[PDB]
Design an enzyme around this catalytic site. Sequence first.
Site, PDB file in Angstrom:
ATOM      1  N   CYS B 104      35.360  36.887  42.848  1.00 14.69           N
ATOM      2  CA  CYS B 104      34.247  37.450  42.084  1.00 14.69           C
ATOM      3  C   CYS B 104      32.996  37.718  42.910  1.00 14.69           C
ATOM      4  CB  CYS B 104      33.906  36.560  40.882  1.00 14.69           C
ATOM      5  SG  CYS B 104      32.633  37.253  39.825  1.00 14.69           S
ATOM      6  N   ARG B 107      29.036  36.455  41.365  1.00 15.04           N
ATOM      7  CA  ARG B 107      28.678  35.044  41.213  1.00 15.04           C
ATOM      8  C   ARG B 107      27.209  34.626  41.333  1.00 15.04           C
ATOM      9  NH1 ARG B 107      32.920  32.106  44.931  1.00 15.04           N
ATOM     10  NH2 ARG B 107      33.098  34.227  45.807  1.00 15.04           N
ATOM     11  N   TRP B 276      29.701  42.167  33.162  1.00 15.89           N
ATOM     12  CA  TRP B 276      29.408  43.591  33.084  1.00 15.89           C
ATOM     13  C   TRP B 276      30.081  44.253  34.288  1.00 15.89           C
ATOM     14  CZ3 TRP B 276      25.069  40.171  33.125  1.00 15.89           C
ATOM     15  CH2 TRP B 276      24.426  40.007  34.370  1.00 15.89           C
ATOM     16  N   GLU B 281      34.833  49.615  40.031  1.00 16.86           N
ATOM     17  CA  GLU B 281      36.007  49.164  39.303  1.00 16.86           C
ATOM     18  C   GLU B 281      36.452  50.277  38.346  1.00 16.86           C
ATOM     19  OE1 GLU B 281      37.265  46.490  40.333  1.00 16.86           O
ATOM     20  OE2 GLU B 281      38.748  45.873  38.832  1.00 16.86           O
TER      21      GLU B 281
HETATM   22  C1  HEM Z   1      28.048  39.281  35.768  1.00 12.84           C
HETATM   23  C2  HEM Z   1      28.882  40.359  36.060  1.00 12.84           C
HETATM   24  C3  HEM Z   1      30.079  40.292  36.827  1.00 12.84           C
HETATM   25  C4  HEM Z   1      30.459  41.184  37.799  1.00 12.84           C
HETATM   26  C5  HEM Z   1      29.667  42.405  38.275  1.00 12.84           C
HETATM   27  C6  HEM Z   1      31.749  40.773  38.291  1.00 12.84           C
HETATM   28  C7  HEM Z   1      32.545  41.520  39.180  1.00 12.84           C
HETATM   29  C8  HEM Z   1      33.855  41.191  39.582  1.00 12.84           C
HETATM   30  C9  HEM Z   1      34.714  42.011  40.406  1.00 12.84           C
HETATM   31  C10 HEM Z   1      34.367  43.380  40.983  1.00 12.84           C
HETATM   32  C11 HEM Z   1      35.890  41.360  40.552  1.00 12.84           C
HETATM   33  C12 HEM Z   1      37.113  41.905  41.315  1.00 12.84           C
HETATM   34  C13 HEM Z   1      38.050  42.734  40.424  1.00 12.84           C
HETATM   35  C14 HEM Z   1      39.142  43.483  41.199  1.00 12.84           C
HETATM   36  O1  HEM Z   1      39.268  43.299  42.433  1.00 12.84           O
HETATM   37  O2  HEM Z   1      39.891  44.273  40.578  1.00 12.84           O
HETATM   38  C15 HEM Z   1      35.771  40.117  39.815  1.00 12.84           C
HETATM   39  C16 HEM Z   1      36.762  39.145  39.717  1.00 12.84           C
HETATM   40  C17 HEM Z   1      36.681  37.975  38.976  1.00 12.84           C
HETATM   41  N1  HEM Z   1      35.606  37.603  38.212  1.00 12.84           N
HETATM   42 FE1  HEM Z   1      33.744  38.468  38.163  1.00 12.84          FE
HETATM   43  N2  HEM Z   1      32.160  39.620  37.666  1.00 12.84           N
HETATM   44  C18 HEM Z   1      31.158  39.311  36.741  1.00 12.84           C
HETATM   45  C19 HEM Z   1      31.221  38.240  35.853  1.00 12.84           C
HETATM   46  C20 HEM Z   1      32.229  37.311  35.744  1.00 12.84           C
HETATM   47  C21 HEM Z   1      32.209  36.207  34.784  1.00 12.84           C
HETATM   48  C22 HEM Z   1      31.200  36.073  33.618  1.00 12.84           C
HETATM   49  C23 HEM Z   1      33.342  35.444  35.060  1.00 12.84           C
HETATM   50  C24 HEM Z   1      33.802  34.210  34.475  1.00 12.84           C
HETATM   51  C25 HEM Z   1      33.061  33.362  33.634  1.00 12.84           C
HETATM   52  C26 HEM Z   1      34.034  36.131  36.147  1.00 12.84           C
HETATM   53  C27 HEM Z   1      35.259  35.700  36.674  1.00 12.84           C
HETATM   54  C28 HEM Z   1      35.989  36.383  37.632  1.00 12.84           C
HETATM   55  C29 HEM Z   1      37.309  35.975  38.059  1.00 12.84           C
HETATM   56  C30 HEM Z   1      38.101  34.720  37.667  1.00 12.84           C
HETATM   57  C31 HEM Z   1      37.730  36.966  38.877  1.00 12.84           C
HETATM   58  C32 HEM Z   1      39.092  37.019  39.553  1.00 12.84           C
HETATM   59  C33 HEM Z   1      39.942  37.961  38.709  1.00 12.84           C
HETATM   60  C34 HEM Z   1      41.323  38.223  39.295  1.00 12.84           C
HETATM   61  O3  HEM Z   1      41.702  37.553  40.284  1.00 12.84           O
HETATM   62  O4  HEM Z   1      42.039  39.106  38.760  1.00 12.84           O
HETATM   63  N3  HEM Z   1      33.351  37.265  36.541  1.00 12.84           N
HETATM   64  N4  HEM Z   1      34.525  40.039  39.216  1.00 12.84           N
HETATM   65  O1  7NI Z   2      34.683  44.712  37.986  1.00 16.80           O
HETATM   66  N1  7NI Z   2      34.088  43.985  37.193  1.00 16.80           N
HETATM   67  O2  7NI Z   2      32.959  44.147  36.783  1.00 16.80           O
HETATM   68  C1  7NI Z   2      34.775  42.792  36.665  1.00 16.80           C
HETATM   69  C2  7NI Z   2      36.074  42.543  37.096  1.00 16.80           C
HETATM   70  C3  7NI Z   2      36.783  41.434  36.642  1.00 16.80           C
HETATM   71  C4  7NI Z   2      36.156  40.467  35.659  1.00 16.80           C
HETATM   72  C5  7NI Z   2      34.910  40.761  35.282  1.00 16.80           C
HETATM   73  C6  7NI Z   2      34.008  40.071  34.364  1.00 16.80           C
HETATM   74  N2  7NI Z   2      32.928  40.798  34.373  1.00 16.80           N
HETATM   75  N3  7NI Z   2      32.994  41.868  35.171  1.00 16.80           N
HETATM   76  C7  7NI Z   2      34.209  41.940  35.794  1.00 16.80           C
END
Ligand code: HEM
Ligand code: 7NI
Lengths: 400, 401
Positions: B104, B107, B276, B281
């Site tokens: 993520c 974070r 968000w 993505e």
């Molecule tokens: C605040 C906005 C957030 C943004 C901009 C964000 C963005 C991202 C991105 C770009 C990825 C990679 C996805 C990919 O490679 O296809 C990711 C993965 C992840 N995010 Fe975040 N995230 C956010 C919030 C969160 C929240 C609120 C949680 C959990 C409480 C979270 C948990 C995770 C987890 C567990 C992954 C790994 C998913 C996987 O392995 O498939 N994210 N996030």
């Molecule tokens: O690309 N993203 O913004 C994204 C990817 C995977 C999980 C979450 C949760 N919020 N945003 C996420």
Amino acid sequence: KFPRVKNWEVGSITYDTLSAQAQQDGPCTPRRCLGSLVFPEQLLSQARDFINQYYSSIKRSGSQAHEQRLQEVEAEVAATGTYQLRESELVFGAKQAWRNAPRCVGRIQWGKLQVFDARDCRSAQEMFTYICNHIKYATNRGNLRSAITVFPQRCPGRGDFRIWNSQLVRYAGYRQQDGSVRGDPANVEITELCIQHGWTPGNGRFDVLPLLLQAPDEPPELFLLPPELVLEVPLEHPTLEWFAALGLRWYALPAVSNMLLEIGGLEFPAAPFSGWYMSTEIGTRNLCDPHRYNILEDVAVCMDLDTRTTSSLWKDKAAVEINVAVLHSYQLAKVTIVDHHAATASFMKHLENEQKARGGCPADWAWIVPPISGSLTPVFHQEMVNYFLSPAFRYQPDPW
Amino acid sequence: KFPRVKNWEVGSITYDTLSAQAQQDGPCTPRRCLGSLVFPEQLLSQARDFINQYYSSIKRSGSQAHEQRLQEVEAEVAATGTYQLRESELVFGAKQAWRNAPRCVGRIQWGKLQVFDARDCRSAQEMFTYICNHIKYATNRGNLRSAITVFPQRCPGRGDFRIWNSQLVRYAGYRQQDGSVRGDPANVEITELCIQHGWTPGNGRFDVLPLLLQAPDEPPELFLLPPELVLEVPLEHPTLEWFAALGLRWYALPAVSNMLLEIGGLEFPAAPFSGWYMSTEIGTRNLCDPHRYNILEDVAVCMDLDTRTTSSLWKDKAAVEINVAVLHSYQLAKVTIVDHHAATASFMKHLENEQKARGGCPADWAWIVPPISGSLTPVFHQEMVNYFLSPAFRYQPDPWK
Ligand code: HEM
Ligand SMILES: O=[N+]([O-])c1cccc2cn[nH]c12
Ligand code: HEM
Ligand SMILES: O=[N+]([O-])c1cccc2cn[nH]c12
Ligand SMILES: [Zn+2]
């Protein structure tokens, strides 16, 4: 047991059985992955394995000639502490080292490498002659040919042959007063070493550096590359008429000269190799890295983009046009160049060829995927397995 | 003993001491690296470690409260094979899991997470209500707020609560009699499962799928999200007037719903979370991946680019404009979104914060670096250490497999 790797674009799976053959240790452990980090009886076990590889390659494994070779090397090592490779073994070994390089996306070309044997080199002057010959042969007026020149091996109780420069052709980096760098920031140290050893510095952004060549137990000797041997490409854009005015240029020949070639336990500290450029290396890394020429903002301003906000994607737009300028310019100059789409597609074919030939292929995902538009290429969606096989090319500390 | 990591842009060096505390094993070995691959006594030690984490977090380590807590958890596990978490612990645990997610890039926001406790949920219908309330709060009419809803934990004696969908909001993928797919190709299996379970499908390219929710040991049940709860953004380009004619759109809320939340040895198979979108993505992966909407060629052709040769970089140009359309469209619709340059810059600050706070940060380089313009972002030049820490979000097998 055998890593199962999936291609996510197609859903196909293969097993990398070759990895079980990995001969050396990487930096990863089950507790943490360090994949993103940039950096006597033993000699005998490595030598035998290599000789075994060689005889298998000519389909003569188990022959009396194979046995004789094994005994020959064991005898030489007992008597001298080292041994000598036959010409055919050196050629096979150098090709294998390229084939085994996990970070190279241009490996589909591995079998066509031209290997020059310079193990008869006696001095810094003879080294220079070999280097000029390599450059002439490899450059071939724009129709680049892959090649490697191997200088004498490391020997106990005797200094090494070493090429101080990181590449045969590099641009000087001059520390200015204000702390800035004129030219290539990556080459400040080598530039200053050249000046210290007697080179009269220029003051441009693209001044070709001289060579500091070191013969065993001798201080490095300075040599100027004849400008007629160094083919360069002035950069222009196909539609942005002002691009040409920026005065940007890059050289035709990418010739890494600071890596160590290891074959059957033997080490060759000096063995410069060269192929041809993948366009992103010049356009994206060399010209756009923040710690390199860093021309992104300068170009975006000329394209009249809104550099006030990240969301305008001005960096991305500028980067794409810089790469277009590189490709267009090399093609115009009739100098071999491959774009990242063509290169990655050829690597997928290489992976397939290798799956059939050896049951696997060591590949470092982070280096195979291009610095721009990663997911737009097929390699991004392909899981890979990274491991060390020998013969190999390795990093080594600078001679100073 | 401690990994030395270097930033190649700045030259600076740090050591990830936090890595030495890795709680579980990854897939790598000294022989080969597999980082690019996408996928009672035991309970007690994990539980005690979690309790220790919680007490250190509130600066009461070694207090009598800390000691009683440990004894209570031990007493419960000894008598029941599981234990009851306190509300404050669940909240702390959910934030740590996000904090610990190696992949993520968002974070920097880990401390700001709304936690909805749904551990006393008793049916699929009630699960639907909890989900609708989560979507409502999280969407907040476009000013998105991070949130997670935690359903009953896995326990001896019964099956698990499970959400069959991979995200709360996803578009259907319909197999056409011709082998092609209308809609999202990634969603063909779940689409077919919804139909098998009673859903009469639509026939569009962006049909929001119904939720297939499962209560312990019962067949899953179908629920359709009221359309007024699902905020969507129609895609247009600031200068390419014809882009709007493509009829593209995407949903506002990225809500992952198939991962298992692990806290102190306890497992929550159903605990959907949302933040968000990072623009790439949507713009790069969802719209340009060859196995997804795959719109690159259509766009390049309307842009009148030469698609007969790779060296014209038609693919790169089209992708940049698609990402521009996504950012422009969400900004116009007033829906939270972050571009890859802003997101990676914030993650660099996060690494700095975590270095001071815990002496490191588990990061998966391949996932942190964006799918387009990697080397143009600071994270590309930053070496990283990937390892597993708990609390954590983990992948789990699909409920039908
Ligand atoms: C605040 C906005 C957030 C943004 C901009 C964000 C963005 C991202 C991105 C770009 C990825 C990679 C996805 C990919 O490679 O296809 C990711 C993965 C992840 N995010 Fe975040 N995230 C956010 C919030 C969160 C929240 C609120 C949680 C959990 C409480 C979270 C948990 C995770 C987890 C567990 C992954 C790994 C998913 C996987 O392995 O498939 N994210 N996030
Ligand atoms: O690309 N993203 O913004 C994204 C990817 C995977 C999980 C979450 C949760 N919020 N945003 C996420
Ligand atoms: C024929 C054209 C060739 C192309 C297009 C090509 C391309 C590349 C690229 C793009 C990289 C990664 C650099 C980066 O972006 O960080 C690389 C690395 C490498 N290549 Fe190739 N290569 C070619 C020929 C060769 C040859 C002839 C050899 C040796 C015989 C070779 C040996 C290597 C090695 C050892 C590395 C790793 C270097 C390092 O880690 O610093 N390459 N190559
Ligand atoms: O990017 N490249 O083309 C490249 C990078 C590193 C080494 C070599 C040798 N030929 N081409 C190379
Ligand atoms: Zn690894």
